[model samples]
Target: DGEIDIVALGDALTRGTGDESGKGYIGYMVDELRQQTDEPIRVTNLAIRGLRSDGLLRQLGQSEIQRQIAMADLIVMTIGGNDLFQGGEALEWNVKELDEAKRQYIANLDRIFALLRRLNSEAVIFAIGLYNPFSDLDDAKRTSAIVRDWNFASAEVAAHYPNIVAVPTFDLFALHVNDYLYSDHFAPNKEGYKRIGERVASLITLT
Candidate 1:
């Protein structure tokens, strides 16, 4: 009765794509949790390296996946980075095309959050929102605006759910984007992951 189960789901962020230490934000978050409670903590990572929301929706169909979700006490996920970035080509805006993409992304979250809440009504869900990795580039101003809207839309979708919290990472990286970035430039490095991990932990309170 004193143990906690954490289920991590989503894309590259969950897989430690650029966390050279191999310990992603989930690892750090778990570390912080340990400090907060003496109870045992178990982690199950069901994330694919390059998964998008569509892929995640498809993944929910598996029995094992459903089993994990049903068993979880706290759920963590970072999605939509790949969806909006397109593995890196969406940096430049494409008129109505970008708008269309955002519309579909918003729709996916509605379904995803609904399914999650249905599977485990008691579990608290923390959906990590995206930050602009290109904040230091020439189109910084525009990218930042789009990212703000993107996060806003994501939060709006989460609002429809009972316990989902769409936590924003934009402000964390907005001022010093490059410092927290990995050598490759987009992935979050160690410090970056730490900040986000701790940030998420800050919002939680144990009963």
Candidate 2:
């Protein structure tokens, strides 16, 4: 309708890490929005590289971030991956550690959603789910399963809030995990970011 203001927060994925051009998903989405609509679409990306859920919580505490979020029409985030992956370290069949990490991440997520809703109840919140970078490993199947479970649980949490959409991205990287991911097998490359950006852009336009 009118000018659309977007505020993005979270980790490297949100910051568009592997994208050489550095636009990442937010830039690509903004580009799409501009092309699709005459309305002004302004974006303020507050995402930091290697940020975790707790780091994001601290970012939310800032007055500047709160001000931007308060005036935003749409708020997008990509988190929890770092919490689970712990910087390129393999989960390595550690059920107990992984489970506990997920538990804490979900609780952090709860507080995040609550904080955002409290700040600006009218804004649409889109939280992109995790994808398995370890999908190419021998334990690919197990890792993939765990990633799916995490996404499912995250979606369940999102359902508890209003206007919160948990966007699933596991499928995007499921098949050609090598193609979408960087050498580190964690962050998505340019093409990978393009795919995610397009999906998010479509959602924003259709809504």
Candidate 3:
């Protein structure tokens, strides 16, 4: 490998939210990838905090973003969390709302993958899955199941595309929910990001 160009796009997870160090999984993944090769690893992160799938759709529409994706050798993203969580309010959760949200999120993801393929068909796309932050809640037992369903649906969407891979981050935070998640019960801390980054980097290296 000579030089690699990576384009990261999606939500706060993609932007590395809970890590006080601000490196997130992307930074760690980049660092790991760098260690494996002599190539100059260049990255352009278009991810934003609090970004939902709709916002990501808008970002994908921009010509500059399209251009960057076109030139990218690899692309990574994390989305759909904002859509399901609904602004940090996980208590008193509604099942029906989540079902409808998953439907819409799947539809949006279809469009996102389609657009990315149109812009750059060859670039490997890594779509990170969701983790349950409310596992500590009183009624949180079912939360993991819901997250699995969402990630399953997301994986199904990624299956439609040839080079797209849906990486599962749910288990990383599933066991020690608080260890990985922040006080807000969302987003990963440094250690959590490290796990995610290592997982992703391993996949990349393998591929």
Candidate 4:
């Protein structure tokens, strides 16, 4: 019952979806932490595949993820990818369905921050901004803007809470969108994931 208490919650990115290593970069993060800190740290990953920020907010309210959030000393999140990638009528803003997705994102961010603050008085919330895998794809241009807008909104949301830091995965991936992205071009490959993990570790270390 006295295990270390560092919790990670979010999406498949948190679960290391495209990494050959099943644990993803989380293993790397913990190892680095052990090297730097004396505190015995326990990391519990609770990210689900296809989870969006709104979904995370909903689940954080009434699920195991919530309990994890409640008990967490620090929370790491990687979401908004699915939301930005929702392509088609639901995601399109032009001739098809209205892309009210942006508004929804702001609201979800507010809800997530509010809940996180309530759950842990002093917990640090680190939310990763989405990287663009489709920036090179002609069809993905519109969605790319949406994702960029989403990331900016995320940064704005994080600004509301000094304890919250929006890790910028967008620029990092934009640097090598095609080379680092996986076959799907939406998820990062092993090398790309490693870079992301290192970024996460560096951010945590600074904290």
Local distance difference test scores for all models: 0.88, 0.87, 0.87, 0.76
Candidate 3 ranges with C-alpha deviation above 4 Å: none
Clashes of 3: 0
Q: Write the per-residue lDDT of candidate 2 for residues 58-177, one digit (tens) a residue.
A: 889999899988998889999988887884366344788888889989999999999999999899899999988888788788888888988998898999999999988888988968
Residue 53 error, candidate 2, Å: 1.0
lDDT of 1 by residue, 19-131 (tens): 76878888888888888889999999999978988999989878899999999999999888888888445644786877988898888888889999889999999999999
Worst 10 residues of 4 by lDDT: 89-98
TM-score of each: 0.96, 0.94, 0.94, 0.87
Q: Which one wins on TM-score? A: 1
State the lDDT of candidate 3 residue by residue for 1-207, as single tens digits: 466999999888888888889788988888888777877888899989888888898899999888889999999999998888874376436778777888989999999999999999788999999988888887677878888888999999999999999999877886868888776677788888999998998888722
RMSD of 3: 1.8
Question: What would the per-residue lDDT of candidate 4 be over residues 1-207, giving only the tens digit for each residue?
Answer: 334477777787888888776657677777777887677788888789888878988888786666677788778888776765665533355533224666776789888888888888787788888876777766667757767777888898889886898888777777657777777666777888878778888877533
